[PDB]
């Protein structure tokens, strides 16, 4: 029975040709909910979920500004690591963070995060103690340093175990009838031969949510990972996940395979076999 | 770090020819965000091409879902081209109704 | 940290230059605000360069470099009062400071209402109140700024729109408790073990993140500690 | 609700 808010966080520069892109995301569980584009002609943040269309117009402004705060840090941050590792005005860098939380059933805080990316590579990030920080290079260990002495993880852990939790609680409880609410996987079986001799087993979990979903192929009951193919947990565009596996097996011989699937909205694990 | 997009080109409910439906171009696992992509029918662009805001997974590279609303038929075919700078030409995926 | 002339002099009509400086500016917009003795301060620029619905034309602000400048030009009598510029402290998480403040003579339905104030004997405790009216309360942050007696702002506390996150000034940490109770449109400040230095004017303010300003002001709770 | 990022490197 546990939920996350999480925010994304994208800042690239292109100096001489404007000010940085910056984006920003948020996300509860695998629904997201807002966007912010500094290149966008509204400047300001967006809904992309129904049920925050129910937040007044305080909630719109009031998030604008905080995101746009947090642009403008961002911008001085990215002149910042160029000084750092000594980087020229030509290049297009690119400074990620992400931040939120993570709530128990009943509401309990469980987790945070705050972490940075230069380049795609580490920076900083707030440790599970939300007391302390890890830096990956030298860098980040100057940062580390300024933000230990000004007891910067003091009011980050206050934000998340604070304003990330009551934000999350707040639009689980709007968002219920879709946040709350599991979606099983239908499931079904293909079967495409490949030559006179072998044929390709695939089963698929379409229409779930969440995205968490785990399908194993087993031979005469014992696990087979021999031959199989996995395909990534793909957005269908509509809220919902698929997933397919797949096997190659010797043709005559396909009812020796099963697959199992496992999800959340299932009450129980399924069991498939091809039956044409 | 440079990290090369995977990509599926998939609908998203199951074909029917002469139904309408979603085609799906899902580009993940890649790093940094400067990626184009475009959906072709019978290898010509598609103009009217929507894709998802910019995010990114646990390991800090990015995903986007580029779609388009179509009409699949038998001898109409689909594909999704990429480019991005781990590529030195463009990759191309052909859609397969049961992938 | 944010560092003003004491002080301006000038005659009616001619133009008034207040300055300050801090490193945050570079990084962060610079507001100010004037404070008449008698009144509540007021928001006369906001974003560097923005000035408020009812603000006049003649306050301008500009904010390069390091430095913040609000301009009054054609300086009239009635501008006679102090002027403090105010910023986020960006060494830090959530640190709003404000600048030590300059004083101008010139010579030839929102609502917020605060209560508690009184004398208090040193190492004693009060609690402080503000009703809030004509605006949507748990939607923002709001603040405890206090003056001490012929002395600057000194942002004290804040609490978070439902409440969750609170901040303190290191000057009050342990010892005062900001919260709210959103159904009675209150907020609250429980201080304990109450100092000489303590004694102050406690304004109420409403933070809005979309100007990045202190818009909204009560009237002040006076606390005086003696005895 | 979001985090108002103050913090410099």
């Known amino acids: 029975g546990s939920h996350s808010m999480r925010y994304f966080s994208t800042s690239v520069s292109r100096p001489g040709r404007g000010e940085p892109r910056f984006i920003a995301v948020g996300y509860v569980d695998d629904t997201q909910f807002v966007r912010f584009d500094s290149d966008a002609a509204s400047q300001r943040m967006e809904p992309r979920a129904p049920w925050i269309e129910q937040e007044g117009p305080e909630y719109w402004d009031e998030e604008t500004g905080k995101v746009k705060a947090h642009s403008q840090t961002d911008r001085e941050n990215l002149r910042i690591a160029l000084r750092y590792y000594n980087q020229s005005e030509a290049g297009s860098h690119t400074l990620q963070m992400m931040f939120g939380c993570d709530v128990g059933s009943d509401g309990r805080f469980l987790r945070g995060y705050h972490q940075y990316a230069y380049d795609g590579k580490d920076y900083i990030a707030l440790k599970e103690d939300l007391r302390s920080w890890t830096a990956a290079d030298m860098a980040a260990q100057i940062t580390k340093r300024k933000w230990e002495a000004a007891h910067v993880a003091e009011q980050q852990r206050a934000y998340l175990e604070g304003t990330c939790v009551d934000g999350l609680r707040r639009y689980l409880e709007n968002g219920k009838e879709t946040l709350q609410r599991t979606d099983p996987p239908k499931t079904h079986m293909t079967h495409h031969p490949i030559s006179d001799h072998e044929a390709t087993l695939r089963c698929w979990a379409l229409g779930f949510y969440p995205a968490e979903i785990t399908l194993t192929w087993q031979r005469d009951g014992e696990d087979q990972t021999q031959d199989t193919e996995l395909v990534e947990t793909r957005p269908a565009g509509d809220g919902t996940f698929q997933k397919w596996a797949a096997v190659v097996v010797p043709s005559g011989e396909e009812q020796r395979y099963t697959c199992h699937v496992q999800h959340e909205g299932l009450p129980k694990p399924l069991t498939l076999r091809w039956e044409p | 770090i440079q990290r090369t997009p995977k990509i599926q080109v998939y609908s998203r409910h199951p074909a029917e020819n002469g139904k309408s439906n979603f085609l799906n171009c899902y580009v993940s696992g890649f790093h940094p965000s400067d990626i184009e992509v475009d959906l072709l029918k019978n290898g010509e662009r598609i103009e009217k091409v929507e894709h998802s805001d910019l995010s990114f997974s646990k390991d800090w590279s990015f995903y986007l879902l580029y779609y388009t609303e179509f009409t699949p038929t038998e001898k109409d075919e689909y594909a999704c081209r990429v480019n991005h700078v781990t590529l030195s030409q463009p990759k191309i995926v052909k859609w397969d109704r049961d992938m | 940290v944010l560092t003003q002339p004491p002080s301006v002099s000038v005659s009616p009509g001619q133009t008034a230059s207040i300055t300050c400086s801090g490193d945050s500016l570079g990084n962060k917009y610079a507001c100010w605000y004037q404070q008449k003795p008698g009144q509540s301060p007021v928001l006369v620029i906001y974003q560097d360069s923005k000035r408020p619905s009812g603000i006049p034309e003649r306050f301008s602000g500009s904010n390069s470099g390091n430095t913040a400048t609000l301009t009054i030009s054609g300086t009239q009598a009635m501008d006679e009062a102090d002027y403090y510029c105010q910023a986020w402290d960006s060494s830090r998480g959530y640190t709003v400071v404000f600048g030590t403040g300059t004083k101008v003579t010139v010579s030839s339905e929102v609502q917020l209402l605060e209560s508690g104030g009184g004398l208090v004997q040193p190492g004693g405790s009060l609690r402080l109140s503000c009703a809030a009216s004509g605006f949507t309360f748990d939607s923002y942050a709001m603040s405890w700024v206090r003056q001490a007696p012929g002395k600057g702002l000194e942002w004290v506390s804040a609490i978070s729109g439902y409440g969750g996150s609170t901040y303190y000034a290191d000057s009050v940490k342990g010892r005062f408790t900001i919260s709210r109770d959103n159904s009675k449109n209150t907020l609250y400040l429980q201080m304990n073990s109450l100092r000489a230095e303590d004694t102050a004017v406690y304004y109420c303010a409403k933070y809005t993140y979309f100007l990045d300003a202190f818009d909204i002001w009560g009237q002040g709770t006076m606390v005086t500690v003696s005895s | ?9």
Not at chain 4, 1 to 9: G, L, M, S
Request: no cysteine.
């Open chain 4, 1 to 9: 609700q979001y985090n108002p990022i103050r913090t410099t490197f």
